[PDB]
Amino acid sequence: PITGLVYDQRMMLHHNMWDSHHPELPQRISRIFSRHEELRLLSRCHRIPARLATEEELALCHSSKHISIIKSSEHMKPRDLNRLGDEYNSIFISNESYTCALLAAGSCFNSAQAILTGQVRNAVAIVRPPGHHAEKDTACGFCFFNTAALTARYAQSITRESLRVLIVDWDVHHGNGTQHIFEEDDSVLYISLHRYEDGAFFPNSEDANYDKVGLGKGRGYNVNIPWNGGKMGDPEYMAAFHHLVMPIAREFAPELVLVSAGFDAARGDPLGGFQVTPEGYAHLTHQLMSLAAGRVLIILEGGYNLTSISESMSMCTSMLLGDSPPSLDHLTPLKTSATVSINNVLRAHAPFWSSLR
């Protein structure tokens, strides 16, 4: 089995002209790439080239207006760049942002194509800016276009329209954009785990609560696992996977798994406040590899401690390459609120998934 890897230094060009220390740093991707080299994982992977997404591809998920506005930023002077970014929630823009967002998406399309044609079994995409907060019609939360959502639709466009895609979003933040894009869709199952705090944590919406199960044709196909009142870590994530993610995923029987793999739930993250370990992410990856005949694409989302994200994503790639899982620390009993969260999701989704009964 072959594992693909996409990384392109051009995605470092997106930068914050006013706050060069903003946490969504260019070196997030070069540091992850370096750690793959240091651990001798890079030479064990097959390099997949980056490419630009086309505007037609962007329209798989995004409005023509939103595409046009971000595209227009390539030609803006700093004053226009600053004013435009301030129109969104938590966005900075440079003249290279649009290109970098296109490369992040195109890299993932090429990776999904390699998986779906059997050139590689699985793959990892070391991309920025991230995607999961981007909505059909707007940028948000450091994200311009929803790379994972676009990759699901691209995957369908090269196979069949109803290809079953599972998106597991383990970034510490709810992927509001991904949920909304697929909220009425039963071909793309969205499962997010996220710090919620009764709606107080970014992106600050009750759309992230467990009772949002999807709409219309998509009822049952949106699974939110929201954490409240606890510094969650490996025990809680393992339990959510055992009780919720894996039973639902096996019942859905995806033909492709995309991971919105933010590493901001990681021990050491300056924004997430959680303590998932690199060995925890490895175990989560190893479990997902049992789905979809192993067709798994791991897409970088957030994650802001450069050391934590480099170790964590490298451990995921080690799993994709077939290395055995490292040993978890002794798992403490779940924080009591985590048991409450899991049981709330079970009650919300047992109507739709007989594996939860």
Ligand X SMILES: NCc1ccc(C(=O)CS)cc1
143-172 positions binding K ion, by CB under 5 A? 169, 171
CB 211 within 8 A of CB 348: yes
Using CB under 5 A as the binding rule, whether residue 173 contacts Zn ion is answered as yes
* Residue 263, Cβ density class (10 Å: 0-12 exposed, 13-18 middle, ≥19 buried): buried
Closest chain position to ligand X (CB): 302
Tokens coding 202: 């970014």
3-class DSSP state for residue 319?
helix
Residue 198 marked ligand-binding: no
For the bound state, the minimum distance from the C-beta of residue 263 to Zn ion, rounded and expressed in Å, comes to 9
Residue 142 interface partner, choices ligand X, Zn ion, K ion, none, CB cut-off 5-8 Å depending on type: ligand X
Compute φ and ψ for 209, nearest 5 degrees.
-75, 165
If binding is defined by CB under 6 A, does position 271 make contact with ligand X? yes
Nearer of residues 57 and 301 to ligand X, judged by Cβ? 301
CA distances, 51 to each of 62, 111, 122 (Å): 19, 10, 18
Residue 67 Cα distances to 15, 62, 141, angstroms: 19, 7, 17
**Closest separation in Å from C-beta 333 to Zn ion:** 27
125's CB contacts (< 8 A; 6+ apart) are: 5, 6, 104, 107, 108, 111, 297, 298, 299, 300
205 binds ligand X per the rule CB under 6 A? no
Query: What is the nearest approach in angstroms of ligand X to the Cβ of residue 302?
Result: 3
Query: Looking only at residues 133 through 172 of this chain, which bind Zn ion when binding is defined by CB under 5 A?
Result: 171
Is 80 marked as binding a ligand? no
Q: Which of 70, 302, 312, 334 binds Zn ion (CB under 5 A)?
A: 302
> Does the annotation place 36 within a ligand binding site?
no
Q: Is 21 a catalytic residue?
A: no
Contact between residue 212 and residue 184 where contact means Cβ atoms under 8 Å apart: no
Length of the chain measured in residues: 357
Q: Give the residue from 273, 298, 291, 302 showing the smallest Cα distance to 177.
A: 302
Considering only 262, 268, 278, 280, the residue that binds ligand X (CB under 6 A) is 262
Residues 127-156 as x/- pattern, contact with ligand X by CB under 6 A: ---x--x-------xx--------------
Token pair, residue 24, equals: 């969504």
Q: How far is the CB of 42 from ligand X (least distance, A)?
A: 25
Interface with ligand X includes 281 (CB under 6 A)? no
Site size with ligand X, rule: CB under 6 A: 13
Provide Rg for the chain, Cα atoms.
19
The active-site residue, picked from 15, 36, 132, 133, is: 133
From Zn ion, K ion, ligand X, none, interface partner of 218 (C-beta below 5 to 8 A by class): K ion
Place of tokens 């790439």: 33
The pattern of x and - marking residues 88 through 107 that bind ligand X according to CB under 6 A reads --x-----------------
Binding flag, residue 182, K ion (CB under 5 A)? yes
Residue 185 C-beta: closest distance to ligand X, Å: 22
Give exposure, 136-155, as e/b (b: 16+ Cβ within 10 Å). Answer: eebbbbbbbbbbbbbbbbbb
CA distance 154 to 152: 5
List the binding residues.
Answer: 171, 173, 264
Q: Which residues bind ligand X (CB under 6 A)?
A: 90, 130, 133, 141-142, 171, 173, 202, 262, 264, 271, 301-302
Which residues contact K ion (rule: CB under 5 A)?
Answer: 169, 171, 182, 185, 190, 192, 194, 218, 221-222
